[PDB]
Amino acid sequence: MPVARSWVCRKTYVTPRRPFEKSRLDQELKLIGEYGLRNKREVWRVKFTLAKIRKAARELLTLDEKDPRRLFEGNALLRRLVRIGVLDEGKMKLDYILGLKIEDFLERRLQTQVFKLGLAKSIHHARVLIRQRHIRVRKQVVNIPSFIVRLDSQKHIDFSLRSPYGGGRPGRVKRKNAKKGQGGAGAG
Amino acid sequence: KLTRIAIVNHDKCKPKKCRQECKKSCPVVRMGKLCIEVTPQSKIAWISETLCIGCGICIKKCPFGALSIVNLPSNLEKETTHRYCANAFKLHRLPIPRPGEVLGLVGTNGIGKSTALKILAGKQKPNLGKYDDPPDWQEILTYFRGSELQNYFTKILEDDLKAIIKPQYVDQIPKAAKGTVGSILDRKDETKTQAIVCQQLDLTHLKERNVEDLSGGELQRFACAVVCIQKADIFMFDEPSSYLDVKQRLKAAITIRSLINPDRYIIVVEHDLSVLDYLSDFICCLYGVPSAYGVVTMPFSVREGINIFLDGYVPTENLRFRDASLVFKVAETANEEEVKKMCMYKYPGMKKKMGEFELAIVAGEFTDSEIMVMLGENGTGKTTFIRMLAGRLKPDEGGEVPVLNVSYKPQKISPKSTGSVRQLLHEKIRDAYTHPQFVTDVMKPLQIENIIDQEVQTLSGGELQRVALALCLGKPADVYLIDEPSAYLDSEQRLMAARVVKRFILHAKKTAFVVEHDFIMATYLADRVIVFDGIPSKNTVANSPQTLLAGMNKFLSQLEITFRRDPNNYRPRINKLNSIKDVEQKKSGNYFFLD
Amino acid sequence: QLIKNGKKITAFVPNDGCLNFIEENDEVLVAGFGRKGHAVGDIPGVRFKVVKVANVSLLALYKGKKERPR
Amino acid sequence: MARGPKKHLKRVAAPKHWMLDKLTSVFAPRPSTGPHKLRECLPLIIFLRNKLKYALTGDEVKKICMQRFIKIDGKVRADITYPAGFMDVISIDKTGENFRLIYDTKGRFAVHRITPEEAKYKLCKVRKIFVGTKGIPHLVTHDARTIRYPDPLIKMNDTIQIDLETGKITDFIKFDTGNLCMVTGGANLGRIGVITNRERHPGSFDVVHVKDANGNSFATRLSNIFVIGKGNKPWISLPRGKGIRLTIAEERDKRLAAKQSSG
RNA sequence: GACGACCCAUUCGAACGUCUGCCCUAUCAACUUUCGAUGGUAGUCGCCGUGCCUACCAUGGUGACCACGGGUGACGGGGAAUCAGGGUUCGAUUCCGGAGAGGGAGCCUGAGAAACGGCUACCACAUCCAAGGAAGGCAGCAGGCGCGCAAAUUACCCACUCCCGACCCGGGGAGGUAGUGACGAAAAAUAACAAUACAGGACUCUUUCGAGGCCCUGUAAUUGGAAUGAGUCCACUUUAAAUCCUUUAACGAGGAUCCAUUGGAGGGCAAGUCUGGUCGCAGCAGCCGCGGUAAUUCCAGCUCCAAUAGCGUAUAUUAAAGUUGCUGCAGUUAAAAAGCUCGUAGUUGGAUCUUGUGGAGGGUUC
RNA sequence: UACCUGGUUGAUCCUGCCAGUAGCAUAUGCUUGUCUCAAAGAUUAAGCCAUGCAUGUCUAAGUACGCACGGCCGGUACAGUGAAACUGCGAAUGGCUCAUUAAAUCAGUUAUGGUUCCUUUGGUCGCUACUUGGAUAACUGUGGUAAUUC
Ligand code: SF4
Ligand code: SF4
């Protein structure tokens, strides 16, 4: 039967062709350990978005200089890399897109920024503060550690207003310990 | 899961041309067991109902389509609504009720009938087979989601609709409830309904008599009358047809079929001969093994559903293999002894009264070779005409006292014993002559746990009639006295209750007087017959005994009812109140045929 | 012997002692041996293996998770 | 099977210029049979619900029309799927406003409000000329209007002006070089320019060359050219952007520079 | 104003015709033809052109540039999977076109049907009967039997999207809502941090020994306080009425539970030349190979490896395959040049027939 | 990401295939906490089907003597709400499946100067008469058949 639904979706990563290559295994584990990730799929996502960026820049570099399509799509791809802080304003040409690395994108995650901005004591503590509703971006409580921070959004990371750090009510442990402590005198 | 068997039931089967390839392709035959038997010039093959497994390999390889699978019933563990106790009976499926039409249930006795009605009425609740922490109206009303029962059960919980049910056993009514003469009916849920039922159920008795005065044929009509005057949205009629006369079964069906119209639900169940196909609009059938489990079919139309039970025995669901049209004395045989030795008990007439009611008997013959059937309507007092014998009332002011010994079985029983029925067998000798009087009756089918040594206070009332018959047959007599012997018996064991008495008495050289409503019992037992006439509860006479062709034609003529019988299945059927068959029969004076 | 064609097959039974579960005149589910119709290893002329017995898996019987219903 | 005419329209099969969403539904309004082709009209329900937003559902459109508020070419229409099209006027006398249907330069109908003295006439393209019984001459327009006794100078492809209270001809523009036109089909849909050459073929299609206000040049089949003014000046008021069709790089630069859309 | 009708023009179409485009097969080479095959003249029939059909006449029409015949687990297209460049395989399936309502045939009504939720008959099934008769078509939505390796509830509503009628009002298993659902896709928990003892390594004082030392690991007898949703459950919000999600009061964590699995550890290919049992047996092993009394490979304990809310196996198919080769293979000896020569179609085919000065944009002439 | 590795020998260099490696879509095994999407009796049998539903419809404006309900009293055609029945329109669209079908269907491209067309929209609508005829349905009344939307 006809229906008002839609069926558009896609995959966001690819698996490596050699399963047990020693040189590949420890390189991926060093990226997991330095950035505080959960699994290999979380690294293979970032390699796939970089590969699609380089595949587009390598096409536009074939066309003549000042071709109408090379002018329009090239200016759009370069603006969009600067907006997330991955590329320097002082560089700004397609030739420098081919010089980017995976560690340029892993540094722009909210989990990395919560640790580097000094709201947390480790890259492993930062993920737990985000996922437990303690942190805020501009006006909004955010709950997703892989959120990518825009260059004007950068100076507006903070604690939540309804949180035991940030100026809110105490948690359920401190409330129970105080209650039963006063009850130690009797009638509580 | 289901058991499966191959069947060779095809016409013009051809061992002469098929090269016997069904025999050669069977794996059970390849492993060296005789599952298929056939050879050239034999007429039709034989196939084992127990060595066979449900694989279906031979069916692909017969040159003609002569062979196919049927399923057989098994203990499937699917769809269990309720279980009776730990390790006991399984109900399986439940039917769906529909408004503004009549649903009829059918099947053998004990198969799960009354427990479905109790669940639908909300007097029981389903438990899904869980014995420990059983469900309560939360998992129930979630187990039913996606079905019509979901939107139904929520209304009986919220009081948006309410239910009422006629008792299975009506002899409890005079003990379970009380009032004066008349008043027990007067104070029910509406007034106007009581005045209109007076045209179609007989209300002459209850304005003169107490409820504990009543006969079983008054109590059935009183149970039907008192349910029709109450307010409900759903009504259930468990056996509206026991202790009830051939004319009165039609009158009872008519006053049930008037309830239907104003968006109300109705469910009915019977073991009948000729009236369920006047009362119902749809049929459901129950199948299984009665001490252990039952299962409910999808619904059928009336004529179709009756044929699936009584002429043929397999439903559209590709299953049952059982009933084989057991609806008549199908063999039509006679081959027994003719003897000129005889003894005589001939007696004079009398006049008598049980109340404000005139009764009389004419003088006549009685003799040692014969069984006498008694014919006449309910309220003709004829249970008291049996009770004269063995001397309990008016022994010698007309009639005569018995020369030695007489044995008696009553139509009303209310038991008073303790511990087991087993000790009551001391009243008879069992080992000296084991069949038919015990092994083909008390122990049939399957030698079941339900009867062997139970208390009569937990025994079923339909099995209590069987053991009460089996006990009273045990003592010596010249005469045996019987009334209502078919009460609460299904069609299989009605013929066994007729066989167990006639096959015994005709070889013992002994007598009986017997009383029945049911046509099949009367036409098989009799060799001479007695007929009553007059006005019920006012003035009635018992006639001199007659030959069967003289007796029953006068009885059917007095009822203004006449019969048809079918050549393909022997089922006896009623003709409607006016018809070409009715006028062609009553101008001829013949009321039954091919006898 | 296969149900849909009535033709005959021989099949291997994996693992130590699994032949004790199989009995006779009952249903098995059978699968390929891993080489697209050719034989495998030291076994001469066997192209198939058993995977299910009477609607229970040989792995669930062998690891003690289930038993044959009787 | 197909045993007669169809009476439904699937939403992915509907004309692209209506801009219907993907996920509310399976069906779209089938335009009522009438003066304009199914591919070339705007159903009245899409104008009231989706463009002007006076109603949130099709039932709120039905109970606007049944109160007799809506006029098309000066006639009251109660049908919610009536096929309005190019050069028609819609009047809503209760709110006090008037509209004309004209193409936006991206090839879709703009909303275009007009003064009540300009709501008194419309422009019509000539489709046919013929002579009936007793020698009486007849004219046919692009919107199915039939006129008796036209001026004998009015020929094929010309534009005529009519007053809506009486339906009679007032004035006309000849098809010839140097006159202003709008493009009503193909890829050049919604552009405006002056006619600069006509190239003709005996059998098959003639081709017209048109010149822009900014000096761009474009061409189309003669069936797509509608004349709107003698020489350089139009006989109707024109919407924002005036048919100039700027490219995606010019459109980016004005959107950044002007800071419009609440920047 | 409403309704109605003959004729033009519109709109929605329908029907017939033009040009170019197709999977395998020669163990299919000749085919069609008053039993209309190709064409001409007059007519009949039809909504209209026409061998559409009839009478008379002529002797034509197609094929190696593959006709005619046979096969197809063949409905066509938009499209889908895989892919350096070139390709190979798939498309019953929500949009568009066609065909059909058990199998064949005939026909009424109407603007429109050779209609099947219309009718008549034969052929195959099959229901009721008082044996005279009467009634039938789920490849609509739910539901059942049979088949098989293989596929969900006989639930609620016209509120939304649209359609039909005489209509602002009635109707809709079209369509919407909830149930089942590890086909498949996106996001993302299962522990964070201090103190203490032992441990690594910088650096300083000192010939060396030893001490001070500051930043990171574990893990045990076991310490300490703080944070939180998974669950339970009141209220608002949600919607036709509800559920779910989001919002918010009250309970909710010390680890021995609020306990992560599926396959492996000789090589290809990440990870034990541990300890007990069996003895060419039981078994393992895609492939090469392990087991015959001191097994790195079987059966088990411990330890370790890989991916992770997922992982293994059977079978079709794309890449790897420059192992079908157009780009781009090979034929002395590994598989393979007709014994030799002529020759029609097909593919391929030698040389030749009007230029430099001047100006613009740009160079130092084109 | 334009890629290879194990296996013919006492050892070497080749030919050549078998086996491994990654994706995709059907079945199947073991395992499972939260949350947003959503395919699903095509493959075999276009095999056979119990029961319920899936197509109807009235305005100020074709025909109102239904005591069916009703008013301030009366028919001045005749009030007013209005079951049933007659008349008009729709039921040829939608939904389901993939059996047949190889110059056929289908796609792009063109043509009716070789045809038909309910409805919508615009033209056109002047070569006993102050109003004719008879006859059916709803309704009332009497029936036939085991049985039907007889
Ligand atoms: S079943 Fe078939 S094959 Fe077997 S004997 Fe009968 S006809 Fe022959
Ligand atoms: S079904 Fe199988 S087992 Fe039964 S008779 Fe046929 S071949 Fe034998």
From TrEMBL, chain B:
Domain ABC transporter: 76-312, 339-559
Protein residues bound to Mg(2+): 168
Listed GO MF terms: ATP binding; ATP hydrolysis activity
Residue numbers binding ADP 2: 379, 383
Presence of the UniProt keyword Iron-sulfur in the record: yes
Pfam (any one): Fer4_RLI
Residues where ADP 1 binds: 84, 110, 112-115
The keyword Iron appears for this protein: yes
Residue span(s) of domain 4Fe-4S ferredoxin-type: 43-72
Homology family: Belongs to the ABC transporter superfamily. ABCE family.
NCBIfam families documented for this protein: PRK13409.1 (NF009945)
Assembly notes: Interacts with PINK1. Interacts with CNOT4. Interacts with PELO. Probably heterodimerizes with RNASEL; this interaction inhibits RNASEL.
Name recorded for this polypeptide: ATP-binding cassette sub-family E member 1
Source species of the chain: Oryctolagus cuniculus (Rabbit)
Gene transcribed to yield this protein: ABCE1
